[PDB]
Each structure stands twice: as structure tokens, then as C-alpha cells.
Amino acid sequence: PNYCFAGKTSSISDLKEVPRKNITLIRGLGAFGEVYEGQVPLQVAVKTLPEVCSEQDELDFLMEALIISKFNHQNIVRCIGVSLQSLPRFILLELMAGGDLKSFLRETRPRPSQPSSLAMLDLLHVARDIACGCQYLEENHFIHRDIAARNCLLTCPGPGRVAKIADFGMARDIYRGGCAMLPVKWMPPEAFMEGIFTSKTDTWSFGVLLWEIFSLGYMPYPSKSNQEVLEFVTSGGRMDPPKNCPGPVYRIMTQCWQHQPEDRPNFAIILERIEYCTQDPDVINTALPIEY
């Protein structure tokens, strides 16, 4: 099977096959398939394909490799290569020691133990990082379909951290699952209703990611089920600001959640507005809540 991105066609032959003897698994790092820290030395993350898998699982794994390998942007996780000619098959990825963004936010919340673990600027930098990645996808006409905190990774826990889009499983499934597994809480009305997807789809999802970020890792639409959210959003309902969220930041969210896709900003505009928030002393001097 071939893969097309940015007007070019690649195949399995285009993937950089790394000799299996050059790859060593160091430690597990935590649904389908496991992820390890590895060495090729170059430190990598290793995603494995279970040997007990269907032919469709194999094609899915291949397509994931093709998709990530063809992106070229600092805010999308790099693919070092693959090891598909030995079993179990490997995809070799940029090692992201900070882990996933949702877990990071939850575990690094300000507490009386760590009163200054995070500040507004840290959150705005994460938002900018992912918005930069989204802008790259948008300008290359790639619709992610699942922009959410769980699908982003951090290079490290500490101050120089960079956030990157990591998981492209939904886009992979669509490129060629069930209702219960659909990320409804991240989807715009035209998406779950008509199955219409555009870049304005990802704009809506990014608004929800922004809420995730500034809530410090809460599940969107607290206390609402998927179907309750669907009816809520379809009726015009929107989330309230996260605790202590600056007005200028919340306004970016609500612009991302405009009912009509044409009324939602593209990512160039979103980046401009995030940048403006980062300049505003009243925004960045706002204290985040301390979780007791």
C-alpha cells in the first residue's frame, strides 16, 4: 500500500529500515502494543507490533510508520526509522522523556509541595508548540481529527520542555473502532453529524486542548457523558473558563468553538493570538490554582 502526503507518494520501501542487531530495548515506558525506551548511541522510543495480530493490524502499523516518517516539523515527533523485517516489528521514534501532556499536566499541578511547579507562561508555551504543529498540518492539508492532550508528548518535564503532536492513529484509521471510541468531546458539530472534516475540524479540537491545558489536565465537559456533550454542543452549549483562566485565553477557546467552521480562526490566527497573550503581563502574571 502507498501513502500520499504533500502531493508525494511513498511506500514501505521508503521507510528507513534499521538493522535489528543495532537496536536494544532498555526498559518499558508503560492499549495495542507496548512502548519501550531503546538505543540504536541514539536514544529512542520503540513502538512494537504484537506478533499475534491481524493482517489489518499489520497494515495499520505500516501506515502509521509511513505517516510519521513523512512529516517534517519540530513540533511533530520524529521517526528515526523502523525495524519491519524482524519480529516483533518496531517503529523507532523520538524519545519524549516528558511523557504525554495530559499526564504531565495532572502530575505537575501546583501543590503546597510544589507551589511554583507551573506558571501561565509554561501553559502558553505548550499551546504555542502544538499550535505550530497544527499550522504545519493545516498548510499541508492534513487533518489530524484527534487533537487532544493525550495525543501530545513532551521532550522533558523541566523548563526547556517542547510539546509535540505524537499520536496519529485516528488519521491513520481514516486514511485506510466504533461509536463508543470516537473522541466526541473534541469534535465539532459538523464532524459527528455529517462526518464532514476540514482543517476547521482541528481548530475546534485545539480549542478543547486549550481548555485541557489551562484546566491543568481535566477531562473536558466535567460530569457530561459523550452523548450529553453531543447534545450540549449541538445546542450551542460551551465549556466555562478553566479555574483562573485569563479572559484573553478563554476568548481564544470560544473563537475555536464557533458553530460555523468558516467563523473559526485558522492556526496562523490562533498563533497570533497565543503570542499576544504571552506578551500581556496581566495574562502571564496570573497565578494558577494550587491543588490542595
UniProtKB/Swiss-Prot annotation:
Binding-site residues for ATP, renumbered to this chain: K47, E94, L95, M96, D167
Effect after changing I68N: In NBLST3; somatic mutation
Effect of substituting M63R: In NBLST3; somatic mutation
Domain Protein kinase: 23-283
Effect of I147T: In NBLST3; somatic mutation
Tissue: Expressed in brain and CNS. Also expressed in the small intestine and testis, but not in normal lymphoid cells.
Source superkingdom: Eukaryota
Outcome when changing R172Q: In NBLST3; constitutively activated; retained in the endoplasmic reticulum and Golgi compartments
Localization annotation: Cell membrane
Effect of F142V: In NBLST3; somatic mutation
Active site: D146
Phosphotyrosine PTM sites in chain numbering: Y3, Y36, Y175
Modifications after synthesis and translation: Phosphorylated at tyrosine residues by autocatalysis, which activates kinase activity. In cells not stimulated by a ligand, receptor protein tyrosine phosphatase beta and zeta complex (PTPRB/PTPRZ1) dephosphorylates ALK at the sites in ALK that are undergoing autophosphorylation through autoactivation.
Function: Neuronal receptor tyrosine kinase that is essentially and transiently expressed in specific regions of the central and peripheral nervous systems and plays an important role in the genesis and differentiation of the nervous system. Also acts as a key thinness protein involved in the resistance to weight gain: in hypothalamic neurons, controls energy expenditure acting as a negative regulator of white adipose tissue lipolysis and sympathetic tone to fine-tune energy homeostasis.
Disease tied to this entry: A chromosomal aberration involving ALK is found in a form of non-Hodgkin lymphoma. Translocation t(2;5)(p23;q35) with NPM1. The resulting chimeric NPM1-ALK protein homodimerize and the kinase becomes constitutively activated. The constitutively active fusion proteins are responsible for 5-10% of non-Hodgkin lymphomas. A chromosomal aberration involving ALK is associated with inflammatory myofibroblastic tumors (IMTs). Translocation t(2;11)(p23;p15) with CARS; translocation t(2;4)(p23;q21) with SEC31A.
Similarity field: Belongs to the protein kinase superfamily. Tyr protein kinase family. Insulin receptor subfamily.
Domain notes: The EGF-like region drives the cytokine specificity for ALKAL2.
Quaternary structure, from the entry: Homodimer; homodimerizes following heparin- and ligand-binding. Interacts with CBL, IRS1, PIK3R1 and PLCG1. Interacts with FRS2 and SHC1. Interacts with PTN and MDK.
Name of the protein in question: ALK tyrosine kinase receptor
Originating species: Homo sapiens (Human)
Coverage span on the entire protein: 1094 to 1401 of 1620
